[PDB]
Amino acid sequence: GPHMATGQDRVVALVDMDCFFVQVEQRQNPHLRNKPCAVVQYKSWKGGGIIAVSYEARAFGVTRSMWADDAKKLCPDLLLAQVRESRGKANLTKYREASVEVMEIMSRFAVIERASIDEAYVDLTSAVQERLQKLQGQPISADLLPSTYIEGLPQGPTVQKEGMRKQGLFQWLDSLQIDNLTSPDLQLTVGAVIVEEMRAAIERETGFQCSAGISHNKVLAKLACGLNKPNRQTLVSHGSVPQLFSQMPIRKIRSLGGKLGASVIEILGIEYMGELTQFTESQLQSHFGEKNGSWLYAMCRGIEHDPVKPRQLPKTIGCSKNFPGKTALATREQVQWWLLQLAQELEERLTKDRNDNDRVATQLVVSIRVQGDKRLSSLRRCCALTRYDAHKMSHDAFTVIKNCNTSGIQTEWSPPLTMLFLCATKFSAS
DNA sequence: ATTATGACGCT
DNA sequence: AGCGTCAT
Ligand SMILES: Nc1nc2c(ncn2[C@H]2C[C@H](O)[C@@H](COP(=O)(O)NP(=O)(O)OP(=O)(O)O)O2)c(=O)[nH]1
Numbered sequence: 001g002p003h004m005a006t007g008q009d010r011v012v013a014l015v016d017m018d019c020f021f022v023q024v025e026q027r028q029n030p031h032l033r034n035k036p037c038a039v040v041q042y043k044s045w046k047g048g049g050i051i052a053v054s055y056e057a058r059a060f061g062v063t064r065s066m067w068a069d070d071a072k073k074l075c076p077d078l079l080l081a082q083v084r085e086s087r088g089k090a091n092l093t094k095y096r097e098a099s100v101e102v103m104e105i106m107s108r109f110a111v112i113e114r115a116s117i118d119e120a121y122v123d124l125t126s127a128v129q130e131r132l133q134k135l136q137g138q139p140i141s142a143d144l145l146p147s148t149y150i151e152g153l154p155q156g157p158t159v160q161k162e163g164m165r166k167q168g169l170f171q172w173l174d175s176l177q178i179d180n181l182t183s184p185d186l187q188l189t190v191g192a193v194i195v196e197e198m199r200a201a202i203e204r205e206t207g208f209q210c211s212a213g214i215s216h217n218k219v220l221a222k223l224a225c226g227l228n229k230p231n232r233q234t235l236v237s238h239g240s241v242p243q244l245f246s247q248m249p250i251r252k253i254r255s256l257g258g259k260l261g262a263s264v265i266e267i268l269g270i271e272y273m274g275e276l277t278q279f280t281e282s283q284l285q286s287h288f289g290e291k292n293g294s295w296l297y298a299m300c301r302g303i304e305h306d307p308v309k310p311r312q313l314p315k316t317i318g319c320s321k322n323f324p325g326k327t328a329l330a331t332r333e334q335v336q337w338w339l340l341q342l343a344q345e346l347e348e349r350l351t352k353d354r355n356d357n358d359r360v361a362t363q364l365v366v367s368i369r370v371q372g373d374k375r376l377s378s379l380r381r382c383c384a385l386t387r388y389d390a391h392k393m394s395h396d397a398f399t400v401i402k403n404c405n406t407s408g409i410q411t412e413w414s415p416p417l418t419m420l421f422l423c424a425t426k427f428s429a430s
Numbered sequence: 431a432t433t434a435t436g437a438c439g440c441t
Numbered sequence: 442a443g444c445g446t447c448a449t
């Protein structure tokens with residue numbers, strides 16, 4: 001009743017750049033704009049692997065993870081841009097720099113948490129209180145929400161999508177009590193106004209379009225963001241959760257798309273998020289552990305407490321390359337050469353990070369994969385990172401991994417290596 | 431032969 | 442510390 005917390009204390013948004021790497025390449029090359037196009041890394045093997053797809057190309061069935069040659073079968077006029085190659089490997093610097101452009105604009109409006117190269121959570125609670133004081137009980141005009149969808153509306157008592165959007169928004173605004181400065185629905189609405197402004201600023205100052213979700217926590221904001229892509233934003237209210245979750249496959253919720261979600265489905269014999277409400281918190285904890293069980297009990301009611309961490313910069317800076325099938329490294333000279341290439345890229349990125357961000361990494365993590373292992377990492381070993389020197393870093397990585405070489409011979413490497421990975425971690429202010 | 435990252439939980 | 446899971 002009156003003591004049952006409803007998880008409506010915060011306003012949280014999730015901003016995700018639409019087909020990011022594609023947009024970066026389309027800004028640079030106008031010939032790619034408003035076309036089916038995709039971004040690929042490498043080229044020789046099956047045309048390269050697609051990692052980003054414009055919405056025009058998605059209409060033909062092109063997806064991430066698809067080989068470019070296969071995508072061309074679905075979409076013969078697909079345009080391709082290739083990721084830059086440096087020191088023998090894909091180099092993603094152009095997209096990281098574009099990411100920084102966007103994140104610095106977002107940070108003008110509120111403290112953000114960088115969740116990926118192209119997505120950030122925003123805690124808008126305080127900004128919303130400020131705007132509410134400025135409004136002075138003035139209603140919110142639909143004109144201030146020109147790209148906003150209200151999930152679940154319209155309902156009750158009509159052909160085109162923009163008309164649908166406007167009907168739902170009008171129903172939402174008509175039911176708003178702008179008198180009450182602590183109304184959660186009002187707070188979400190003002191949050192949506194602020195996100196319209198943030199998205200307008202991003203597009204004006206970078207050329208990039210994005211989608212966004214506005215709700216009371218990170219998981220609902222993330223789910224909301226996906227409901228109306230591209231170039232739109234969606235408000236998911238607390239009240240919309242029962243209907244939304246009643247047909248929502250468990251795997252759609254961030255963190256339940258893998259083994260844990262499969263176990264929820266299999267153990268409980270359910271399919272949809274909403275079905276979780278019928279279990280007690282102790283029941284869920286008994287199946288899935290204390291932490292997961294409490295999290296699921298709250299999440300299926302729309303409640304989640306994970307804070308938006310004030311963290312605009314990545315916590316690690318890493319370099320990795322796969323050596324699949326027959327390209328695997330089977331000589332010591334090979335392993336040393338590729339460790340050096342990875343370490344030279346890492347040195348370049350670390351030196352730029354130190355100059356930009358007043359910090360220094362102190363730990364080097366070396367990960368390898370050996371032929372035959374189905375795991376991402378076969379071995380992970382750390383050593384000290386005391387100088388930004390590529391030859392030192394590559395020598396240190398070789399020292400920590402050299403005992404994996406089964407070959408009695410000194411020149412050969414067996415079993416051959418199918419992945420190398422260097423990661424700088426444990427930053428300190430400098 | 432998807433690949434290149436990056437975050438975080440467990441023990 | 443090293444490994445696994447979840448992303449994508
Ligand atoms: N190197 C690499 N980059 C990747 C990979 N997957 C994605 N990227 C890169 C390329 C992506 O552009 C970027 C952002 O990832 P998303 O937000 O998941 N996809 P997007 O923004 O394209 O589409 P949407 O409109 O649905 O949000 O990360 C990968 O496996 N490897």
Ligand SMILES: [Mg+2]
Nearest residue numbers: 016017018118
């Ligand atoms: Mg995106």
Ligand SMILES: [Mg+2]
Nearest residue numbers: 016116118119
């Ligand atoms: Mg993203």
